[PDB]
């Protein structure tokens, strides 16, 4: 009834040893595509190679740094949700839960070359949202972790693709069943902000809030759980994010007379330009003036410079009146508040809807 | 081919770019006369006609273009 996906990768961003069974795991595209997209989509005036500076130092502080460029299949493919949650923990509203998860992921990992890795990833995302290379097209989604095998610094993991959560058999734990586990920092249900009844079926989304200013950019990651419709979620999110939308509309771009067309077309006795001269023999004295309009529009907010969020459907919960449970348990050698979701069917294609308003 | 005494019957609808071919050719972008002035289809029509002829000589094939389509392979 369910399907599985296997993949081997480097363990510098993901550790299937400490991560609990049932957590979310994401994958990354090849970093070589970032520069090919940045040098062509960077806003006019901005420096396009600050991303390259921010990116090179990331792998300089990562094992096997001489293995970038060929993509033979031995790169850091997958990553964990808690990793990004800890990298951007200074931006979530739940101060204590954020910093607790941060120190926990620092201690449980190598804890020697981990803090440097985190700050490199932090400004890496900061430079990612500096040239309109938004990190919602480079971060895909995998199902919850089910089984793993590791020998040293290289792991083979398998996760569910789509279907019921407790329809698999992990077959090495105490029980043969697992449930979805998430850090309490990313969880954010919108219906209890929008003040509507929470009964019935609810969808799951991931959002990527963007802040665009001068030398100050921010990117969070929220796992929203709402009963709102497939497309109506966009109109719902704008009501809560109305501030950042207006901030971006004014601080997004930092790098002329009208014409009365309908007026002079409603009235006659205007200079006409019949097709007889556009045939193409002397098409300069025919169009000598005909108007001037002195018109040009270069610097204006595009629909891409005012974007502030991008969501995507992941799964639903058919059981009405969900009863998600939040509690603190040990994660390595530290306790972190995790929320436990039961009976969630994965599915849905990876299509991102961008909320630019 | 049939009348070995003249090329065509009207020089306005049989040339490479005659008036009729320019009006309708199917290759220049319902009409019943489309199945005549269109090389892309008359080629395969006459080709399957030839295949029928060769099968008749060797004496299916197709069992069609005789029924449901007379004068289709005959032009």
């Amino acid at each position: 009834t369910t399907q599985l996906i296997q993949q081997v990768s480097l363990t510098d961003f993901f550790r299937p040893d400490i991560e609990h069974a049932g957590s979310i795991v994401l994958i990354l595209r090849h970093p070589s595509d970032m520069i090919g997209e940045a040098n062509t989509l960077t806003q006019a005036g901005r420096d396009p190679d600050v991303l390259l500076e921010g990116l090179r130092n990331l792998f300089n502080a990562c094992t096997a740094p001489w293995t970038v460029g060929e993509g033979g299949g031995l790169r850091a493919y997958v990553t964990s949700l808690s990793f990004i949650a800890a990298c951007r923990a200074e931006e979530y509203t739940d101060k204590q839960a954020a910093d607790a998860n941060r120190t926990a992921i620092v201690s449980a990992y190598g804890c020697s070359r981990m803090e440097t890795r985190l700050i490199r990833f932090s400004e890496c995302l900061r430079a990612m949202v500096q040239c309109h290379v938004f990190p919602h097209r480079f971060i895909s989604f995998f199902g919850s972790l089910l089984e793993y095998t590791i020998q040293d610094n290289l792991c083979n993991i398998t996760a569910v693709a789509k279907g019921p959560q407790e329809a698999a058999r992990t077959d090495k734990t105490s029980t043969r069943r697992v449930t979805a586990n998430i850090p309490a920092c990313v969880f954010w249900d919108v219906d209890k902000d929008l003040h509507l009844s929470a009964d019935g079926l609810k969808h799951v989304f991931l959002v990527f809030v963007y802040t665009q200013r001068r030398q100050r950019e921010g990117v969070r990651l929220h796992l929203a759980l709402s009963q709102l419709n497939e497309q109506c979620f966009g109109r719902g999110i704008g009501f809560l994010l109305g501030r950042i939308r207006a901030e971006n509309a004014a601080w997004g771009t930092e790098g002329t007379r009208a014409l009365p067309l309908v007026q002079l077309s409603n009235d006659p006795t205007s200079p006409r330009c019949s097709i007889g001269e556009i045939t193409g023999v002397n098409w300069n004295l025919a169009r000598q003036r005909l108007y001037q309009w002195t018109g040009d529009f270069r610097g204006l907010p595009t629909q891409l410079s005012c974007m502030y969020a991008a969501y995507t459907l992941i799964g639903t919960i058919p059981s009405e009146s969900v009863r998600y449970t939040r509690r603190m348990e040990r994660f390595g050698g530290y306790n972190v508040p995790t929320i436990w979701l039961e009976g969630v069917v994965w599915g849905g294609t990876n299509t991102w809807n961008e909320c630019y308003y | 081919v049939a009348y070995t005494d003249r090329a065509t019957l009207n020089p306005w609808a049989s040339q490479k770019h005659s008036y009729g071919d320019r009006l309708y050719n199917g290759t220049y972008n319902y009409s019943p006369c489309f199945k005549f002035f269109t090389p892309a289809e008359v080629n395969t029509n006459c080709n399957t006609l030839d295949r029928l002829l060769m099968e008749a000589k060797a004496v299916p094939p197709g069992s069609t273009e005789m029924t449901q389509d007379p004068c289709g392979l005959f032009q």
């Binding site: 497939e230 067309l261 002079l264 006409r272 204006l300 629909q303 | -």
Partner: protein
């Protein structure tokens, strides 16, 4: 296979029960999905926005917000129905054609309120409510209708030919709290389709109509359009500026790329999205009004 149950009120008249049994493959809607439900949500009374029967444009928004379901076999006591929106496996799904227009194989189905003559619907006097069933047309019919109602909307603040037959639309627009929202979402898309790149495409109008002549394709396209065929002989369009960073940037890329996302979004936000695909096995190519066709979940 997820099915929802619809509670039939007791003491129902046999005439109403017979009329209800005739509604076998019609589409209904739900505000909140659940296994057990009542009949007050299917009634038109649940559509009320402020205190009254809803408007058309209000129904356009109620169709997006609410979940959808399809009716299946009805027993004298219960009314079973299956859901379509959420991802669920459902074998052998047939729907009943409710529009006056014919459908054929390979047609996407949309959802819109009845804009033709007074919609037929089951009436329940003893219960005191009246349920109305939505109308289903193909996609192309949906876009042409939507464009006309909004055009009439901005006019306040209609014939349609198809298969050689003309139809008249009666647009109900007595409300106002919904008509202004359609104008807001319309200009918002027009405003975001303006980049630094228009000036290039705007500077091609002279050569455009030259290609309109002596080529034989752009003629009616110039005819059906009005703004471009009037601007081409009335404005000068100052020649050209330069690019800020032109050594590594391509400026006509964003305007041709960003526009794609708007056009795809425009057809959905203005009205309803595609919900189903009709594909019948061992059946006729074209279905007539009142008949049932086996359809696929989109």
């Amino acid at each position: 296979p997820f099915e929802i149950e619809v509670l039939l009120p007791g003491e129902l008249s046999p005439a109403e029960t017979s009329a209800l049994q005739k509604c076998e493959g019609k589409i209904i809607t739900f505000s909140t999905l659940r296994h057990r439900a009542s009949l007050v949500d299917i009634a038109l009374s649940s559509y009320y926005i402020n205190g009254a029967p809803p408007d058309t444009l209000s129904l356009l928004e109620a169709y997006r917000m609410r979940f959808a379901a399809v009716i299946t076999r009805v027993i004298p006591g219960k009314l079973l129905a299956h859901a379509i929106g959420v991802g669920t496996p459902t074998p052998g799904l047939f729907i009943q054609n409710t529009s006056p227009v014919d459908l054929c194989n390979g047609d996407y189905i949309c959802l819109l309120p009845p804009v033709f003559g007074s919609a037929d619907s089951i009436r329940l006097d003893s219960v005191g409510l009246e349920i109305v069933f939505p109308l289903t047309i193909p996609q192309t019919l949906m876009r042409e209708i939507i464009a006309k109602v909004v055009a009439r909307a901005v006019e306040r603040t209609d014939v349609i030919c198809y298969n050689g037959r003309r139809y008249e639309l009666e647009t109900n627009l007595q409300h106002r709290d919904g008509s202004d929202a359609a104008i807001r979402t319309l200009v918002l898309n027009l405003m975001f389709s303006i980049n630094e790149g228009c000036l290039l495409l705007l500077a091609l109008i002279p050569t455009l109509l030259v290609q309109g002549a002596h080529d034989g394709y752009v003629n009616l396209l110039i005819q059906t359009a009005n703004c471009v065929r009037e601007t081409g002989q009335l404005i000068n369009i100052p020649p050209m500026p330069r690019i800020q960073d032109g050594h590594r940037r391509f400026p006509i890329y964003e305007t041709i790329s960003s526009w794609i996302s708007t056009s795809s979004r425009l057809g959905d936000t203005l009205g309803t999205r595609a919900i189903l695909r009709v594909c019948v096995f061992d059946g006729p190519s074209t279905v007539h009004p009142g008949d049932r066709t086996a359809v696929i979940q989109v």
